Symmetry: C3
Subunit: 168 residues, 3 copies
């Protein structure tokens, strides 16, 4: 199911490069140094973050723009969370710019698609266990990623994958 959607439009030229220090996370800063078109990168990340918080519905409840990072796998932006924002396990994101930047965020909750490595008996007591793979056990849970991560690391368990979301 779709949890929320967000769209954001901004004129690239009117976005200051000095905003980099306020909006970017640490891994985004490393990616920023690699970038040839610096003003576009900042504008794009601002738009993606705005679209993300629009998709949540509550906006900036107690969160900062640095709490949400957009990294890159291949050429596509990928969501990285440093806080619990909800129980969505998929963030489908897209970004385009031509003088104006337009960012799209669609948040989705899929049944399952959460991979955890650990004792079978431990997991079946707490979660609905669906399938076994090379990566680990596939479970269904509505627990937010950091809540789940803290619960599992207390035991001899490990969160392998949480949908398509990157954690920390």
């Amino acid at each position: 199911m779709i949890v929320g959607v967000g769209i954001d439009v901004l004129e690239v030229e009117r976005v200051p490069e000095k905003f980099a220090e306020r909006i970017l996370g640490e891994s985004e800063k490393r990616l920023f140094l690699t970038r040839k078109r610096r003003r576009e990168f900042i504008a794009g990340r601002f738009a993606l973050k705005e679209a993300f918080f629009k998709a949540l519905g509550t906006g900036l409840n107690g969160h900062s723009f640095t709490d949400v990072e957009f990294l890159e796998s291949n050429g596509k932006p990928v969501l990285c969370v440093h806080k619990d924002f909800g129980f969505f396990n998929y963030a489908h994101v897209s970004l385009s710019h031509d003088r104006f930047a337009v960012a799209l965020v669609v948040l989705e909750k899929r049944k399952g698609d959460i991979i955890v490595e650990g004792d079978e008996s431990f997991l079946r007591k707490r979660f609905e266990v669906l399938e076994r793979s090379v990566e680990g056990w596939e479970i269904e849970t509505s627990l937010p990623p950091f809540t789940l991560k803290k619960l599992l690391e207390s035991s001899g368990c490990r969160l392998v994958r949480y949908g398509n979301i990157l954690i920390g």
Copy 2:
């Protein structure tokens, strides 16, 4: 499942404020009076309505722009229908503007998420009943909101919530 999607882009400056009388519903007019940036509000509502009808696929079949309202809960636009447009029970909407307004509408049909208060036996004869809550009975139906509303009010039943759609 996704029923349809709609996107709309328009230059705010070229949208006349005089269009307010043609496109806005009564509750939108009350919201319009509160607004400081009047031209932006009109442009945004025009874009949202256009995106909505694009998401339907049939366009303006026999409908008017006043048949669809976009109100506000918190800071997010919320769909309010005054007519039956389909059996979607979720409208995920977003709006952004920076000289150009961009509106996004995603229509979704979720299993259930329709809350009805009334006699248990009456409902089980007609609908697949899923869960009981404080708000009422959760049912699955493909009946459009006004069709459902008219059917229930004929008996001693009441439509409490239809997904995230506002009715009337």
Copy 3:
């Protein structure tokens, strides 16, 4: 479930009409001749194709812009594939332009919604068969449309409908 999303923005005026020969498929060329606003049409089709490949995630793996066509039913763009890009069976698309063109593509995999005509016994050996209609048998499969089409035409079977995707 949502397979991927894509957004694209481009300034219409800076898109050359000469790009028509490079980006358009044969059926799009026939539609292009009918169009009064030629520059808008090209800009829109470029934006839709870009949004489509963004939604795939891999980009232009071994594909061309001519491998993907956007035709029209009523007034809405409709996806036509000439190659296998994935197992999504729904492409929800939208296009708007006002000096800048904005295109949206949402790719979805729905359970079922693939209609095939043929021998009941042949299909039940290979696929999960769901329902019978006037158009044919509804099956669930993760086979891409051309792979499925080639498999069925080898026997006395025919692919009737693949979600809302047009094939060839």
